[PDB]
Symmetry: D2
């Protein structure tokens, strides 16, 4: 009657075992605090800077991740007048059917499934990268893994294939960080407009505590949430596309702001089209477009992606990203448009 397609159960460290091995340093604590503050301001129209969330499609090699972090950390500080730069530290990836689930689920890319090692690796990384003063971002996919990492997160996303999940809007309503919801795979923007409304509200659901115990949590509600236009059946980063979502959100009585995602369905998957989308969004930002509050970009040390018989350094094992040299031109190419939007 029970547990008959359940093969094994294996012990899983409680969040406090990670929270006490890898406590957040004074520096760390202050990166996330400030970074969360900064993005709040950008969302309440009290800042005109651009939230840019840029980085690999998915972490899988902490060494490569650190070269990228300290490279981008320089541009966080050179463009800190037009850009609020945040690194794309994605430990979990939702695969269309099957495939590698991210670092935390399978950190030795071998179906070992050393998920305890996973979070150890993940948390130490998230930790280190926050020390340097760079802020981190991630997709929130699992219902349990947030408790181990979220205190180091400064901006999260709910996957497209999860923007309708009640359980996922429930989670968004309690996270301490801002959150972005992606429009639906077909480009439906209301299922996301709906999640913003839910997320902004209090909920009361079942979940796991830092001690690894089932419990009932009540959430205050999170009003720092926005849409992420990722296009769908056809790219939708246009200035008039933006104007639809803009109107739409006014109809729903939510603030008219948007994060454009340059990749996936706005790039026809062609990794290099992030430059095209990039060149189109910058025109909108120069033209005076006040409502483009942020940007998401897929970006690694080296352009392209590889299958999973050895590992090319610095290159994605999942979605395909623009290389670093392109990144530089892209980020400076934003700061300039944000310059052209006020001076």
């Amino acid at each position: 009657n029970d547990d008959l397609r359940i093969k094994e159960i294996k012990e899983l460290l409680p969040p406090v075992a990670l929270l006490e091995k890898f406590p957040a340093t004074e520096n760390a604590a202050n990166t996330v605090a400030h970074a969360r503050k900064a993005i709040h301001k950008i969302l309440k129209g009290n800042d005109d800077r651009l939230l840019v969330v840029i980085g690999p499609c998915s972490i899988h090699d902490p060494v490569a991740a650190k070269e990228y972090a300290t490279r981008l950390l320089a541009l966080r500080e050179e463009l800190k007048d037009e850009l609020e730069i945040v690194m794309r530290v994605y430990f979990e990836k939702p695969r269309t059917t099957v495939g590698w689930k991210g670092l935390i689920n399978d950190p030795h890319m071998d179906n070992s499934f050393q998920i305890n090692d996973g979070l150890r690796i993940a948390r130490k990384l998230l930790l280190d990268i926050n020390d340097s003063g760079l802020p981190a971002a991630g997709e929130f996919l699992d219902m349990i893994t947030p408790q181990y990492l979220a205190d180091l997160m400064s901006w999260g996303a709910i996957g497209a294939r999860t923007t309708e999940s009640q359980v996922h809007r429930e989670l968004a309503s309690g996270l301490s960080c801002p959150v972005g919801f992606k429009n639906g795979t077909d480009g439906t923007i209301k299922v996301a407009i709906d999640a913003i409304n839910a997320a902004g509200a209090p909920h009361c659901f079942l979940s796991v505590t830092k001690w690894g115990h089932s419990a009932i949590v009540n959430t205050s509600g999170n009003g720092d949430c926005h849409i992420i236009l990722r296009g769908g059946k056809e790219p939708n980063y246009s200035a008039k596309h933006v104007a639809e979502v803009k109107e739409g959100l006014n109809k729903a009585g939510l603030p008219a702001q948007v994060m454009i995602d340059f990749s996936h369905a706005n790039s026809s998957k062609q990794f290099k089209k992030q430059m095209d989308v990039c060149a189109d969004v910058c025109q909108q930002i120069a033209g005076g477009e006040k409502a483009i509050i942020g940007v998401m970009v897929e970006s690694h040390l080296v352009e392209g992606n590889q299958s999973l018989e050895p590992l090319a350094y610095g290159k994605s094992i999942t979605d395909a990203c623009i290389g670093w040299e392109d990144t530089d031109a892209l980020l400076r190419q934003l700061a300039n448009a944000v310059k052209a939007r006020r001076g």
Copy 2:
């Protein structure tokens, strides 16, 4: 940095304690054991019969629910040769934003006595099985299945969650067979990926019968199927069934489906479940063996009402359903259409 928006945590009863208060009776386990095997044999093409998942949209009064079961159990016998009738015991009922469900606000006032809700919902589930009528629920979250899924013989995944990885991960390790609702928007590529996906072994994090996190390694679920339920327009046609039949095979999957006479297929009006029913029996009697099931929002009294004064007995507090006499006709219609085939 920690827990700035979460501001209160309350104690929750572990699965192990609800299975101890309310243990499966030899009868209840018997009904679940046979009912699943019944549906498995159907789903491997080994049985003309039609699985009918029918019952209220949501349960809110255990009393009206035991009455429904005794009635529906009666018909589950009568037509046992043609229909495999499985009652539908749904608690939580997704909505963008009153009622969270029976488990979640069992007292219908935002007291959120999940613990009462859970004791109640399992006890009702228990009794319906001990009487011998299988139940079929809907798995939304990841903690709640650990308290109930032993008394369920079939399950569905909400329309707004068929795309989610976490819910396909959950179907990975269900002992009951699973149905996936196609997309809100009538698409079915998502339903296909979920079947494939839930049919793959998985390893994820989940709560145990004792209320601790752990790692699970599931086996993959082989008894899954799409669930047609409309989109822009309804899609209960046979034009439609022909596409899904095709693509399903193009997907290298068993060209079988289950049609939901409700939701986007009823174009909302609850009585239109009868219209859809009429159309299906044409096919089943026509000779369409790849319609292996149907799903009806059926209560004791037709229509619905709104939470406020007391409530009409036997009339849903959520979606409007056909009442009991529409329920008798519809079941008899289906079972007639069944043994046309011959």
Copy 3:
């Protein structure tokens, strides 16, 4: 590690409280007896508590045939006594032996503790529901949470009266608690127990969820000394003198419960009624301080060797030897005559 051979799962205390909840009546029993005993220890009543029953429960069938017989006398002597059946599920050995029904219910070294706790609590509930309070010994530190709400009086073993953690446990026990003198007949130890248990403590124990935590107790004031013999018996009136004024030197209620079994019987089950005579003589003589007594009683008298391994007889204790029923009615009758004779 090196010496932990196996680790099986244990049903949490919440699970038994949920499968065997106090009926409204049983709640009443547990609660009236608990206030009664408090009123004895304050002098505002003058009946004699009487914890009397088997040495160890091992047949839930005989323990109910017993409880109905003992309950039948409980109601009759209502006004003299305050009978509390002896439902000890834990027993300690000088060295190695069978530890009680909870720790080995099928006395076949199966150690089916989960069955043990189910059987123990179900029996415990049957008895409080038919009006008969239960008394027990608190040996283990985790079992209490599975049973404490169905016990109206509790003892701390002669061999654990010094143990800091058994004092801590009584400091937060909700029923009232009796401490035995040292196995060598020392009072200092038991006085200290009362005093330690009289004050609040902060320590680790396990909540009703099977979870370790820090608990702050309040302190238990309904604590008294149990006299149980030593090298030679302390049921005297000479000793009752010393114990009374030693207790007044500590500055504590000058009262004492007297055991009749164990060292005061000199491991001689029948000599239990020789002690009765002496105490009813003190009690019928105007000794007000004898506020309780305890007596090892079963259906048939004597005992049998589980360590045999023939088949077992019905209603005979498998550990310490007890009187049989006929003596117990007679013993309970003289106690009631003594208490009335006392006024």
Copy 4:
């Protein structure tokens, strides 16, 4: 009907959170691994050396204890041919009724009862000592603290006040290290014999795992236990008492070995008397007492004690200071020389 007297409940970290934050180094694991084996070899009679457990009554300051530890590690390495020296690292102290409970309980010494710091201080201190080659020894009073601390322990005692308990002889029967049971608060050796025998059996009982969940546990049983002579209202360290414990151990069919506390009741409550006992046991050991296999000295940087604040002076029972401690460990290494010939 319940919790009428439970004033409150705060969360306690699981043993695993601490095993993760202060994992044992390769070195610490080795100090432990080796020290245990040493004490096994002594116990089973295959090494004529003498286990010396020595150190403060209670760690209250960790800095003083780290200084003490270096001083004693020098001595341990210098006498390793006659002596196995492990430090007395006693966190949980058992008071006669109500008083300061020790560093794991109320670390800051003011009734905060910050048990989560305590545990944290107590494990880093133990790890630091073990990492630096010096084995450690402590009291096992609680039923839960062992799970955060056990793995950095080479030897433990069961308190004088808790030798008879089923719940403590159960614990002993699963500890990965040797154990010594003290006699009872009057000189009784019967309790200690029974304890060693019980602690030698396997047991099944309820405990908390490394994760903080109650669960069922079967022990294998612990052969590495022995009696700890500590005295009554009259000290029982003189050869006469030693020969009584000897035959008694034979009657109960146990190896006839012993460890002699120099303190508590063989000190008759004055610390400097610990030196006297030493001379006597040193006589016995050099006479050719193979029965005596270890001792226990309460020793600190500053002799004497204070109440509640001096550095390295004990703040519970009085101990000898470092000049007397150097003297004493040497007297012992010499009787261990005499004894071998």
